[PDB]
Amino acid sequence: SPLNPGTNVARLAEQAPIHWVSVAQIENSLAGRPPMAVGFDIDDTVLFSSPGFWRGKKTFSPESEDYLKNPVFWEKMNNGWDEFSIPKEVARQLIDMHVRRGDAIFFVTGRSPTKTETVSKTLADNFHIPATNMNPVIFAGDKPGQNTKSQWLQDKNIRIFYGDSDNDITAARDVGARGIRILRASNSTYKPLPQAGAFGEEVIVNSEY
Amino acid sequence: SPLNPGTNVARLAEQAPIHWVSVAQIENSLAGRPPMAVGFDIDDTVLFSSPGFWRGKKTFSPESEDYLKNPVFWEKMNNGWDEFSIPKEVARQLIDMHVRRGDAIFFVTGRSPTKTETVSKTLADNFHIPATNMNPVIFAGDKPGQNTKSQWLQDKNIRIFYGDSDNDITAARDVGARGIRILRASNSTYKPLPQAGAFGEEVIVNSEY
Amino acid sequence: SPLNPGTNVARLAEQAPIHWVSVAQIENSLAGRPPMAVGFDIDDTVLFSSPGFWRGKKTFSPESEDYLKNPVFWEKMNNGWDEFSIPKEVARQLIDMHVRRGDAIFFVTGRSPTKTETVSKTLADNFHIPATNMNPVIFAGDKPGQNTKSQWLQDKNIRIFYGDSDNDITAARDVGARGIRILRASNSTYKPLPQAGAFGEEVIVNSEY
Amino acid sequence: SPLNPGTNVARLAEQAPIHWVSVAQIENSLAGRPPMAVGFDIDDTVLFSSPGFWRGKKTFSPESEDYLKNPVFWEKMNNGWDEFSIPKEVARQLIDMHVRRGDAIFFVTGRSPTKTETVSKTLADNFHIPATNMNPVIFAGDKPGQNTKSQWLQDKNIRIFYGDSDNDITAARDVGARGIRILRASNSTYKPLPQAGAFGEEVIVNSEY
Numbered sequence A, B, C, D: 001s002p003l004n005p006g007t008n009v010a011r012l013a014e015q016a017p018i019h020w021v022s023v024a025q026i027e028n029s030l031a032g033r034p035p036m037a038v039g040f041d042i043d044d045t046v047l048f049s050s051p052g053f054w055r056g057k058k059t060f061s062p063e064s065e066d067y068l069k070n071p072v073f074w075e076k077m078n079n080g081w082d083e084f085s086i087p088k089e090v091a092r093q094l095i096d097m098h099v100r101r102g103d104a105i106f107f108v109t110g111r112s113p114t115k116t117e118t119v120s121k122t123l124a125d126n127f128h129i130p131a132t133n134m135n136p137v138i139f140a141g142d143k144p145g146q147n148t149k150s151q152w153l154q155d156k157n158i159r160i161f162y163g164d165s166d167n168d169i170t171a172a173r174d175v176g177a178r179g180i181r182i183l184r185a186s187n188s189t190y191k192p193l194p195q196a197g198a199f200g201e202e203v204i205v206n207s208e209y
């Protein structure tokens, strides 16, 4: 592409028509609503867990995505590799806000279920989630052709679902819940990045970290 | 204010929590709604009229804002200096869209009223507004015999009001109309620029030109 | 195009590889250099003169660019329509800086020469340019196939040339002068906007106003 | 910190005066130059190693920065925790470009030295660095028996040094090498982010991933 592409002020100022929101705006929108269930995606929503998925790929399938169907990978991923996962600031702020509200907090992930998992502990510890707000992580798995999260959102009566992927937002849509998008960091190993805002949903500002 | 201030990617990626919308999205939101009255502020909403205001300030009050109280200025500004005003593309798109809907187009301005005005003609001609959708400019304000912008919005049953200033949005909200913000161009002489989105209202993307 | 196009943080943070500079950085780069000749383009560099060109087009050739070859247009443009031209802040700052330096200031424009012109006066007055730094505007004209500015930059020994158009920067290149780009405002009627930085030249930050 | 802070187009279009460059532009600047030594900082320059530093801080000093002085941490960090570090694309492109030139690739780190290290292997493997271009990581610093980064750049005749921290740029400048800045990712745990461009140096676009 051109050595010196240049730019112009129409481009510099250009904004995609995205419904951006802040955590404060979300909290304000909920003012006075009693405790309810809310849910969070995990990967690239509350944890930058690319370190573990990157290790998994290099270890289990350097040339493919097969590691994601490998039980030996999931056993490592769910039982300690989140020691290297970096909690997202947007998640600290959202989880603190939902604890303030007295909301029930659920995590619903496309990760595969394993025999044991330490992920619930990592989340409760890192985010300072009290026992009463915390719920064990739901490992909904990944099955092409099905949104495995939708039925879980329904079963737990989740009213807000935060996530980075299109299927997080459409899971919320499927059940009539409010789907709010978090930006996936640009150094995530899960590419391409989704188009945040592509269902006209709210997207949290500065939510890449 | 360092010579080399530098930057960082948090700053570079930072977004204000604005509800950005497009003309297409606004149109979509009105699908199936019958013809209705809509209204526009003039200055920095549909016309970049700073050229006449710049000339007016230079000619009539170079050291103050007194020109805005000078009938000699307004007679000039409302009877031909808009030949030098630059129509905004955002306004061309909105007015085309509303005309296509069969909506009534109103312009409500805080410009001081004059004996005659040719601003209505300028607007109909520049924006190709059909006679059936066109309405003579309304001069609203707080002088004896005048009615306020809010009062005129109620009178004409204006359901959507477009403008760049805080007072355009509040005038709409006070009567329960939908106030939609247009960005004031950075080379406008009316400074400082407003904080578009300051009341949580919709702001049209790229609406500075 | 899509109703809800969305975005992602790689896009939000993306920067074109442009050599951006500030006026302070330019002045610093010149520290200790004795008085020299410098030159400025006029339209969209020091004056937002779109009001006059817009009036000219609508008056003289609503359906074409023929007004730009019409002597009756130029006579109006160069003898008063700049009363509506809005001086650029970047130009105030650059002209003040060159006056500080004791530099000779030239304006070299692609506007056509007329029998009389009041543009030199408008510039000296609006920018507070002292007699000794000021020089009468050079109306170099426009002739496809020739950069009419290059020979003028050579004749006046201009060492820095500021401008918004590609031919301003290449005029400076032609003569071995330092060509520095100003951003053309997005509400200029001269479209399309140039790609600032496309010759790897310095571009002044925030220079659209 | 208003609930609805709004924005304006001056802010939206605002650019810091940074000398942005691309990898293509850097390569172009070296055209015809024979093979030379170039060097890279490691952390947040070529590896997003925050996962290991995050784990290290949690494990060894949750309430302080003491882990960076703890030999037990460094033995872990330099002997396998980089399996969880994420290579930066900007580094893949730069290292490919320099390898293609036949340049010598050096890595100079302020990480504390350890009895053994497998970081050199991680870097050669991840970046596909041929044995003829590869050099074992240099641990530079101010401990007895060590030499500083500046000293190592002189020793190896490193002509270009890439890094994200101020000290990477100053170490280059102190010995007359070309210091080129890479953006630290916003989800790095090393905070605050540096002001890339703080010394007027080149900064690589989009170099946060």
Ligand SMILES: Nc1ccn([C@@H]2C[C@H](O)[C@@H](CO)O2)c(=O)n1
Pocket: B043, B050, B053, B054, B068, B110, B111, B112, B189, B190, B191
């Ligand atoms: N420099 C400017 C530009 C626009 N306006 C607005 C638009 C109306 O014409 C006028 C109403 O007083 O003020 C202004 O006050 N000053």
Ligand SMILES: Nc1ccn([C@@H]2C[C@H](O)[C@@H](CO)O2)c(=O)n1
Pocket: D043, D050, D053, D054, D068, D110, D111, D112, D189, D190, D191
């Ligand atoms: N959280 C972090 C991340 C990186 N570094 C840098 C990179 C080197 O590994 C180390 C040198 O002390 O510090 C750090 O100090 N702290």
Ligand SMILES: Nc1ccn([C@H]2C[C@H](O)[C@@H](CO)O2)c(=O)n1
Pocket: A043, A044, A049, A050, A053, A054, A068, A109, A110, A111, A112, A142, A189, A190, A191
């Ligand atoms: N590089 C990858 C690939 C997948 N996943 C996540 C998203 C899915 O929900 C789950 C199974 O694919 O793991 C991830 O975080 N990073």
Ligand SMILES: Nc1ccn([C@H]2C[C@H](O)[C@@H](CO)O2)c(=O)n1
Pocket: C043, C044, C049, C050, C053, C054, C068, C109, C110, C111, C112, C142, C189, C190, C191
């Ligand atoms: N819409 C336009 C068209 C032209 N010009 C300028 C640039 C040229 O130098 C000169 C003759 O075209 O006028 C302008 O400012 N605006």
Ligand SMILES: [Mg+2]
Pocket: A041, A042, A043, A044, A045, A163, A164, A165
């Ligand atoms: Mg996810």
Ligand SMILES: [Mg+2]
Pocket: B041, B042, B043, B044, B045, B163, B164, B165
């Ligand atoms: Mg207005």
Ligand SMILES: [Mg+2]
Pocket: C041, C042, C043, C044, C045, C163, C164, C165
């Ligand atoms: Mg010009």
Ligand SMILES: [Mg+2]
Pocket: D041, D042, D043, D044, D045, D163, D164, D165
């Ligand atoms: Mg570093």
